[PDB]
Symmetry: C2
Subunit: 499 residues, 2 copies
Amino acid sequence: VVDSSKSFVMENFSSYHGTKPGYVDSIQKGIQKWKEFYSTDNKYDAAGYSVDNENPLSGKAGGVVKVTYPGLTKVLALKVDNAETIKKELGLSLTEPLMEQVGTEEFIKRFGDGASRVVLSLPFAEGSSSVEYINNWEQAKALSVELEINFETRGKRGQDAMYEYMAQACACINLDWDVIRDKTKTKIESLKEHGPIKNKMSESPNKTVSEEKAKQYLEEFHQTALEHPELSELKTVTGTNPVFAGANYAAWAVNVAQVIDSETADNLEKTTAALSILPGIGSVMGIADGAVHHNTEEIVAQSIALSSLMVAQAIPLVGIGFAAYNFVESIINLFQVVHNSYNRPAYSPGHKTQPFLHDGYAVSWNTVEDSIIRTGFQGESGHDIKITAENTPLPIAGVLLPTIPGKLDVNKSKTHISVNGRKIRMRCRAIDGDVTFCRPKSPVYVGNGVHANLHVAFHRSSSEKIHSNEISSDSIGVLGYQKHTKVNSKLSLFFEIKS
Amino acid sequence: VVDSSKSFVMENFSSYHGTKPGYVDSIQKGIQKWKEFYSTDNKYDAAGYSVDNENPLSGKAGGVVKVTYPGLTKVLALKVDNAETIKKELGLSLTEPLMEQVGTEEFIKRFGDGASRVVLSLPFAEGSSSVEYINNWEQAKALSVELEINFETRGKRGQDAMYEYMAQACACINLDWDVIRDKTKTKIESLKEHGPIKNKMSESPNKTVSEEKAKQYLEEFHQTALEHPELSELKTVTGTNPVFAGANYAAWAVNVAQVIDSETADNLEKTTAALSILPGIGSVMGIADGAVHHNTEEIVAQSIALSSLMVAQAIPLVGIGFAAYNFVESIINLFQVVHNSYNRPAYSPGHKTQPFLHDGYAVSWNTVEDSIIRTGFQGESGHDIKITAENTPLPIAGVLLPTIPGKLDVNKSKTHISVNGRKIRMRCRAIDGDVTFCRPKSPVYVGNGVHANLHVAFHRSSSEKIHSNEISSDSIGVLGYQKHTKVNSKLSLFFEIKS
């Protein structure tokens, strides 16, 4: 229940607390009062819990304060977050509430190691290296409170201030949204007055029409609009990737038009709620294949401007100043949300236990240890990879393994693939490229209701460590179906060499 | 390293061994000699390792024998399959090979509990409830060997005998392949002589043409062929599901035609290797959405016959008697392989740790325990669900949770969703249908490089157990994007009530 190795005593222990609009000044007078007071070691995560509760989606952000305990504070790292489990294994009373007990003197004398108080620690969240602190309200009164930042003060639009701050974490998408807002406004205006564009508007049914005809018309609008000099960079960077095609801008606009009614358009929170549940926003953001391609102020402004003009056109055909106002404001917030996710450290597909999703298949390391190939010893290791597919039966042709004579050979007897429990042995051969190819001895298919475990076993005959120079690739390649140049569907599981 | 609770002593301990063609009689004379002798508790898995090594894919199957140890045998269940790890934690010599040591007297006196010998036990495979036994060769000589079945003797085609046997496990797809082979042959013949069909053949370019034109022509062949009286049931059962459409038969045939050259067509193993790596076989098998729809001899024969005739037509257009011979023989084996997987007990999508794959999203319970909701006590439990998507950012609108006043309420403070480590709190409300809907307080998107953990926390105020009558559904519903009738992409995680 408690990780002693991660627990410690600190003089002048501080942390951070996200603060709602209206409370940034009053909090600095003290910590008063919801059954516990929460803080974190990361001021950027604190920035997260600083948005107005009435309008969580698009509301104003307050700020972040820093709180410090005088004297010695004992930080007690917890293994579990279960109140009952905790009071049980510690030998504490199972009656009184745990956090109340934590502030008692008998508790502090026993777990404090001489500290004036105990603060409980828990991993902030899955996928985060931050910690969350749980503070007893009484003990919390000792906290001095200092301002870290007040987002309001910055006097910026929407949630720009909060996101600009968060982006400091990565020293990285760090855009000036002021510039983007100004350019977006400029381009939408210049686009409305452009002759060729004014023309195409005049060819609009301007009435509720078939969805198919609306899309057809919007695609033509897109094509003509994209020819405007103030959208020239956008024309170039969107000319090649299918995700960024006119068809996808048109599909987005028609979708926006279909979900936005009068009352929705009139409220920013309601508009954000509605836009936030739509598919296809990546086309407008310039986001595909794990990358944010639209990452200059100039290009983001152009895409948002084009989108806005098209939504304007869609409303009459399948659905007001919404297009240039709430829609722009709202979509800017969604951009910021997504950009923020991409700025955060995370595992790419096929790394650790994140699946690799491709051609209808899904594969992943069974556990994190599987994805590690330990080195510098003699002996065997085993590595499990889960494999399935979405619907109809799709084949698994085999697997490509990195091998190093002596330092990393395939154990051909222990390597196998199990399909719904049917254990299938494999035939393994070294091929051109410092790679061993294994094929199943019976046909393998996966699909809805049929899954496999590929078990890779490695053998080490030398105690010598693998130099990062002797491996050609950092991935195990699982091969799916074949599709005058033959090619296999390639499913990658990425590993790390350790120890 | 050793699971005592699963270990035991047995008088007259037996198991099963799969036996290659040519060895079914000689083995019954004794067990001689590859560093260890393998057997299993399941005679049907044994049937698996009974196929000719020169031709593992489509070769002949030998049989299964039963082997019995006289007197008392100690079965020692192992926790790990790592030789080195084992010799270490048991205090055995780290020099001599483990299996050799296992047959020594000093070993048997220590772990045998009075048994005449020890046999080591390991889980057969991931997804199987079978066990595999590892037998020391010397001790193996004591085994008496009795015949269980000899597949050769049965005098059937291909691997029919082996698969017919395996299908006995589920008392269930249990087809008579003799009947299917006979009917398939009959229909292909009757189809060749049919006037309307003979006609369409005469409209064939009968020469290497464009892939697109070949497909176009094959689709017309399909349409006309499907009108034949001996294919009438097939016409009906394939008329509605897109997977079974003419376009998909045509795509299959063109694919077969493109991978089969002269030398391939002339060898059954080579043909099976090549067919086995193609996509789209589910269209011919009548397999979609987790179900085998073509599950009568009559309908399987019709589909195979139609496929054969179309492959015949494809070879001239994009590529011999291959179509009616090796192709039929080969595809029958692939049918049997897949039917076998579906006969085997397995977890459907969204059950245990198997992902639910839908609309570009992938979701799954993080671990098996997560998928269990324990009942009959007072307190909290937590349940983690992994969530991501394949490419562009797709939204998560929220989650539908089953709730029972008092016996199963949502803990609204501990429930949250973390996106690349950004912890997002949720707003939860009871809606029509004994269901609580939670929505994130910030927009959630997942995609390539952005993943979330949805953490569901439940609270129990009553010690009374949940009767299987008070829950409306057996699933937690995660909601994805929205798409004049609004509907959310529905992502299901199925749970079980225990304790």
